[PDB]
Symmetry: D2
């Protein structure tokens, strides 16, 4: 392995071109993005056989300083005329390979820094502010891209993936986990009705890489829509396990977006422990945080 790059390249852009013209789905009212505030955290990795002596001999002649990679990314966010993170990564990658002939491969990760609408009273009525935004530490969109230069100096995207990260959902009832293996290692009781709490990281790949850029937005798959499918399916489903649930979520995603080739899930179980089961004259209970061990699942659904 041989590569280097820059991490935590935060870049905030105002008044990016709005994303509109999206194709709707029943599970989501998502209709586009205003892009008054566009925040991204970018990681960049570059490689190439001509970097060897930078390691083996301390020769920096062909080293793009990582500081300069940060400048490159931030400058390109100012000139970017597109409407998605996926498109932004493509802009950066193509530009970077055309600038630096000795680099054979670039890998980029972009993670949305999300903001939420706030409201203000003005002109006699309360309405959404165009100036004040609330920084969110909840779920966010993600994007991944790998580009390579060939022997004839053409460039090819070799892998692309989009995603939604940091989704934390609890369903208070309508979940079971029964029937699992009961042997000398089992102390977990069967539960007919648990408050399943799951962390979801969902990633998806397109059949055609161009649909990820948003140039023809009707073919774009928004993380917001994926979020809304996941919450809807979790609601609709009498879950039998987290495994059971994410398969059904993946199925719904690929049904809604026939342009997707696959969807990949990384889930974690953070369900609370029960303390009070019976509350007189009430259907409530009390739960508390569990010990640190968490179950997890990794699963791909293919079109």
């Amino acid at each position: 392995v041989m590569y280097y790059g820059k991490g935590d390249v935060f870049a905030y852009r105002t008044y990016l071109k709005p994303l509109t013209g999206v194709r709707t789905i029943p599970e989501s009212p998502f209709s586009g993005r205003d892009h008054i505030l566009f925040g991204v955290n970018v990681k960049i990795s570059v490689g190439g056989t001509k970097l060897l002596t930078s390691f083996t001999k301390g020769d920096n002649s062909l080293v793009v300083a990582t500081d300069s990679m940060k400048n490159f990314i931030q400058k390109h966010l100012a000139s970017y005329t597109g409407t998605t993170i996926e498109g932004f990564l493509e802009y950066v990658a193509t530009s970077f390979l055309k600038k630096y002939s000795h680099i054979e491969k670039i890998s980029l990760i972009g993670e949305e820094i999300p903001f939420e609408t706030t409201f203000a009273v003005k002109n006699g009525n309360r309405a959404a502010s165009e100036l004040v935004f609330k920084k969110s530490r909840n779920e966010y969109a993600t994007a991944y891209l790998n580009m390579v230069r060939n022997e004839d100096n053409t460039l090819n995207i070799t892998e692309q993936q989009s995603g939604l990260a940091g989704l934390q959902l609890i369903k208070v009832s309508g979940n079971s986990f029964v029937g699992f293996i009961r042997d000398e290692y089992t102390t977990l009781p069967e539960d007919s009705n648990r408050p399943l709490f799951v962390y979801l990281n969902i990633k998806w790949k397109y059949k055609n890489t161009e649909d990820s850029f948003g140039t023809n937005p009707e073919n774009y798959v928004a993380a917001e829509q994926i979020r809304d499918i996941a919450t809807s399916v979790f609601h609709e489903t009498e879950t039998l396990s987290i495994q059971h649930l994410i398969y059904l979520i993946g199925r719904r995603i690929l049904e809604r977006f026939p342009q997707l080739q696959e969807v990949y899930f990384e889930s974690q179980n953070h369900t609370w422990d029960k303390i009070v089961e019976e509350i007189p004259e009430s259907e409530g209970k009390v739960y508390t945080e569990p010990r640190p061990p968490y179950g997890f699942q990794c699963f791909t659904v293919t079109q």
Copy 2:
């Protein structure tokens, strides 16, 4: 100083009595809380001169185990019939002093563990789910209470405070910071138009402690309303400093809630650094994260 207690007592309650009957204000559509899911993190501190030998001699005869304090809190959330965190703390404090005669003082902190509505398709239409909630890591309500036992075994609340924590707001334009001291220690340029980014912690005290419990909800001051005043005022104001802004927020809060005696602010400046000032044929710019040092302000406004 001599006291002990328990921290990070997480307790999640389902179907608490809903909060309704709230008095509205122009800045906020807040109309109550469903309380399908009610989450609280509780810290408890207890003291009393009869605890001395537990320290000076290792005599545990009068020590309520901190583990038992956790049990006490969680059990009392199951039996609590009220509608606010402030009321919950009062329930716990009064119960605890009546149980343990040798304790002269209790101090409690409760921090909301907030959840957000999600949506699902069912019965032919998309609607808010009554079962699936999204865990939020953004702002949350808080409450503080101190109770003491007197020589005649009566109990008195000696201090109460409510608050909103974790509010992070950025205003992209309409802020200035000019006119400050320029001497041999000043290298900060004057800025006519900056994207002020502030962290706000806002606490408020009532003129009458009973108005904090929500038993007569019309007198309750909801953290949600405070949130909405802060976002509205930040929007409305051509800010001259963070000091300038939080004074105006405090003023609006005390005008809206004449039952409040004071409001206290802890603010932090996390404004981004400018990278790209001019973008051809566009009013956008690019900013990035600053170095770690942050300015802060602490300020009380009184009625």
Copy 3:
């Protein structure tokens, strides 16, 4: 309340004046600090009636910019000729009040950013490197200082406190917790031999502020020496509770350092849960991490 300031002011000085000649105690080898690398995280808060209109009217004419206070601190670290954080704080406080006549009160917190020696083979043998150091995320020394300007234009230190933070100690054997109250809320089983795991924050005050500065190192009390008393006493003691343990640590501290007026403890309990009680052909046991709730104690020993 009315004040403002700067936090997370990191400053790293190389080749500070070494601290030498500190009187040793039998529990600790500590005699001084080489100060090849001296790292500190400072928080500064300033107050004054003349700051009012900075809040009420947005008048910045008497606002030292928080950015300037960061410059003030970092420049003063470069010009400090002393040998302790406590003395640095006094240097900064005195210089700042002398510079800015409109300030009536300055409060400073300094936290060491600690580093540890590493091995290097020098003349064919391993030695402590004078060049390479390891950044530690374990315990660190702290200092706190308040200074005011009086009616007659004199300056006076109103409060000074040194400390040790982040000490995490576990004693595998020789700890009991028994004899505590058993009633309807008690589920904690008595334990005659538990692996007590405590977090410790220890703060001490001097009889004479002068001694905090280290100008006469014979009277200086180093955090490193406090660390070593705490670990020796915890080893020596069959603890009966954390309460019992910290009282004994405090007594020893005050015996060794008669110039100290008091020692303050903030302790947390993080003892693991036992999973395996007895292992064949061994004295060993297996434990795991507990649920989040943690006990805590706070207690002051006076000379």
Copy 4:
């Protein structure tokens, strides 16, 4: 992808069999581990075609509960008679595949939870306590192991890797970074003498998996010895870049440990910003923390 498992499985064993007789190297004093306290954080992932219907149909009949895998790990730590994390992983892997015939693949990650000796005055003199230990949040050893069940029912280790994580090293002098590309994106000034601050994660593979277990300690490569080579080499070297530095560390590692097949580096640059270039009557300088973006390097040296 299809697998599932348990993470953050903390397990603390007292009085594990000591590791003794490890062949020493001149850069490190390390000869073994007392194992009075042996702490590990395990992550387990299992796969198998027979798990499909657990996802597609919600059939739990062939689901080992993740909670049971936690029990499996913690019980096996109690019965492990070996002396290394690498050997523990093999013990667990082999036992788990033998127990559950429907599993085709197990992957294990083990991370040391490190502890450090403390001082106690025993017979009138300070010594390392056999009872009291300090929890460290600095560097720690790691291990990784994949095992499969073949067609003919035999088990085979498909991958094994040991490592060291969380090493943070700063060298105050003797580091340059010069001669890198200067073009329209370059703003980083050349530096002939910088206080290079690097984060290091080092992972190594053995020529013979057998050597990882420590059954014959003469062939075991301890993370502690890797730590000491890294610090010695960093001291010895006038570094020309982090790239240059890690290549040299790798070469030394492989020279000292000829049984190793390769060494892999993941390095980050966290060098401070300089604030004061020259201080009168001293060789010292002042620095502060940089903006968030950090450089990183990844490189593999082979035997």
